[PDB]
Structure 1
Amino acid sequence: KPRIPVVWIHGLECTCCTESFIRSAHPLAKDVILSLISLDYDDTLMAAAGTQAEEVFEDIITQYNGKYILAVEGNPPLGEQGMFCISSGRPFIEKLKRAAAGASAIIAWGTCASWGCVQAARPNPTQATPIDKVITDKPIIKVPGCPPIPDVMSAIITYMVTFDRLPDVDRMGRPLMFYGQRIHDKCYRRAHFDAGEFVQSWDDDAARKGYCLYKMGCKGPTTYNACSSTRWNDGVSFPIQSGHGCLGCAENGFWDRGSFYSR
């Protein structure tokens, strides 16, 4: 049977969302690409460059008008007439709008496309702007995190292909399945939090026993993500399990909510 067309574009970004995607353990990114979707455009992985790449882009969005999913990594800058991010000699934002116009739905990968992420942190030199502030007439699924969990990314994809619909979302457009609860609502150190058992300086006795990282600045209490349950890299770890507090990296504006090491 035909596989669902996906167009994956890139604005201002670090490429952490593409890298996360290819870490998928189940399904493997290999099998996603070969069997689950048609990844028809993707700057980081595709053979075609330059005019060949433009031809793929134009052909796909024309031929599958109204039928492709648009995945967006990174975000459009509004500064300098959009020429802080240039694609084919024009503002990235023009490519975003053209791609958005033909999509059935959009996936905003990561805190970049969802919220703004690091380039939108004070003082936001480029006027980096999240996708939903620019595209206002399309379903946008926000999949935040810097980056999101690999197996969350692949799970959302498999959900859309298997069930042939978008995940249900909270009021902010995040899939309930993985963003419905807080890190702190499923954190294996909560026993210590409840007991007032806290790491107070790095590598103290409390740290060597896996005590709670709240006094070290953990932002788990205000952060919605699946890290403390699903975990990272095939269930191997997550920030808190490896001894560092949650930064808040799935939440809007997390860079500017004060030092990572303060309350």
Structure 2
Amino acid sequence: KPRIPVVWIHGLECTCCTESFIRSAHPLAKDVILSLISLDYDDTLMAAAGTQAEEVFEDIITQYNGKYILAVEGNPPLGEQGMFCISSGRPFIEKLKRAAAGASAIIAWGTCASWGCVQAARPNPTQATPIDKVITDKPIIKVPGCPPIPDVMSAIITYMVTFDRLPDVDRMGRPLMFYGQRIHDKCYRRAHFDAGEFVQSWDDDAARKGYCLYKMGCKGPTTYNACSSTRWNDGVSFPIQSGHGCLGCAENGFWDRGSFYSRVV
């Protein structure tokens, strides 16, 4: 049976979301690519380069016009006529718009594509802009996080393939399944928060007993994600479990809400 065509493009980014994707434990990324979708264009993994890659891009968006999913990693810069990010000699934004026009729906992977992430932090030298500010006529599913959880990425993929539909979303376009609740509302250290049992400085007796990281600047109370339930890397850990407060990395403008070590207001 034919597999659903997927075009994956990259703007200004660090590639962590692509890296997170291939960490998937179930299904393995190998099995997603071989059996679940047809990953028809992807700069990180494809054999073809240059004019050969351009030919694949053109061929796929033409042949499957209206029928492919567009995955976007990173974002377009509006500064310097878009030439902070250049693809085939032209502004990345042109490639974004062309790919978006033929897509049935768009997945905005990561805080970059969803909101802006680090390049959009003050003073945003390139005028990096999230996808939904440029593409205004297409369904966009935001999957934020820096990067999002590997098995969250693959679970969203398998949901769409299995149920033949987009996941239901909150008012910001995030899948309710994984972004409906706060880190702090499923945090295994919540008992300590409620008891007033806090780490006060690194490696103190409190830290060695796994006490709450609130006074160390944990942004769990204002951050929506699955990290404290689904956890990371096949359920091995998450930021808080390994001793560091949540940075807020799934939330819009998290880089610019004061120091990571200042308390939630």
- Determine if the TM-score, normalized by the shorter chain, exceeds 0.5: yes
Instruction: Give the SS at the match of 1:141.
Output: strand
Output one character per residue of 1:177-207: Cα deviation in whole Å (capped at 9) or x when no partner.
0000000000000000000000000000000
Report the alpha carbon displacement of residue 166 of structure 1 after superposing the two structures with TM. Answer: 0.1
Report the alpha carbon displacement of residue 110 of structure 1 after superposing the two structures with TM. Answer: 0.1
Identity of counterpart residues, as a percentage?
100
Instruction: Give the SS at the match of 1:151.
Output: helix
Instruction: Give the SS at the match of 1:8.
Output: strand
Report the alpha carbon displacement of residue 257 of structure 1 after superposing the two structures with TM. Answer: 0.4
Which whole-Å CA distance do the structure 1 matches of 2:138 and 2:155 have between them? Answer: 22
Report the alpha carbon displacement of residue 151 of structure 1 after superposing the two structures with TM. Answer: 0.1
Report the alpha carbon displacement of residue 23 of structure 1 after superposing the two structures with TM. Answer: 0.1
Output one character per residue of 1:218-248: Cα deviation in whole Å (capped at 9) or x when no partner.
0000000000000000000000000000000
**What's 1:142 paired with?**
142
Output one character per residue of 1:145-193: Cα deviation in whole Å (capped at 9) or x when no partner.
0000000000000000000000000000000000000000000000000
Instruction: Give the SS at the match of 1:224.
Output: coil
Output one character per residue of 1:35-75: Cα deviation in whole Å (capped at 9) or x when no partner.
00000000000000000000000000000000000000000
Output one character per residue of 1:7-32: Cα deviation in whole Å (capped at 9) or x when no partner.
00000000000000000000000000
Report the alpha carbon displacement of residue 262 of structure 1 after superposing the two structures with TM. Answer: 0.1
Which whole-Å CA distance do the structure 1 matches of 2:220 and 2:165 have between them? Answer: 30
Give unmatched runs, 5+ long, in structure 1: none
Which whole-Å CA distance do the structure 1 matches of 2:43 and 2:198 have between them? Answer: 45
Report the alpha carbon displacement of residue 249 of structure 1 after superposing the two structures with TM. Answer: 0.1
**What's 2:81 paired with?**
81
Report the alpha carbon displacement of residue 4 of structure 1 after superposing the two structures with TM. Answer: 0.4
Instruction: Give the SS at the match of 1:137.
Output: coil
Output one character per residue of 1:68-103: Cα deviation in whole Å (capped at 9) or x when no partner.
000000000000000000000000000000000000
Output one character per residue of 1:115-142: Cα deviation in whole Å (capped at 9) or x when no partner.
0000000000000000000000000000
Which whole-Å CA distance do the structure 2 matches of 1:213 and 1:5 have between them? Answer: 44
Which whole-Å CA distance do the structure 1 matches of 2:197 and 2:149 have between them? Answer: 28
Q: What root-mean-square deviation, in Å, do the aligned CA atoms of Structure 1 and Structure 2 show? A: 0.2
Which whole-Å CA distance do the structure 2 matches of 1:258 and 1:61 have between them? Answer: 42
Q: TM-score, normalised by structure 2?
A: 0.99
Which whole-Å CA distance do the structure 1 matches of 2:174 and 2:240 have between them? Answer: 22
Which whole-Å CA distance do the structure 2 matches of 1:102 and 1:160 have between them? Answer: 18
Q: Where has structure 1 moved over 6 Å in runs of 4 or more?
A: none
Which whole-Å CA distance do the structure 2 matches of 1:87 and 1:225 have between them? Answer: 32
**What's 1:7 paired with?**
7
**What's 1:204 paired with?**
204
Aligned residues: 263
Which whole-Å CA distance do the structure 2 matches of 1:5 and 1:187 have between them? Answer: 38
Instruction: Give the SS at the match of 1:6.
Output: strand
Q: TM-score, normalised by structure 1?
A: 1.00
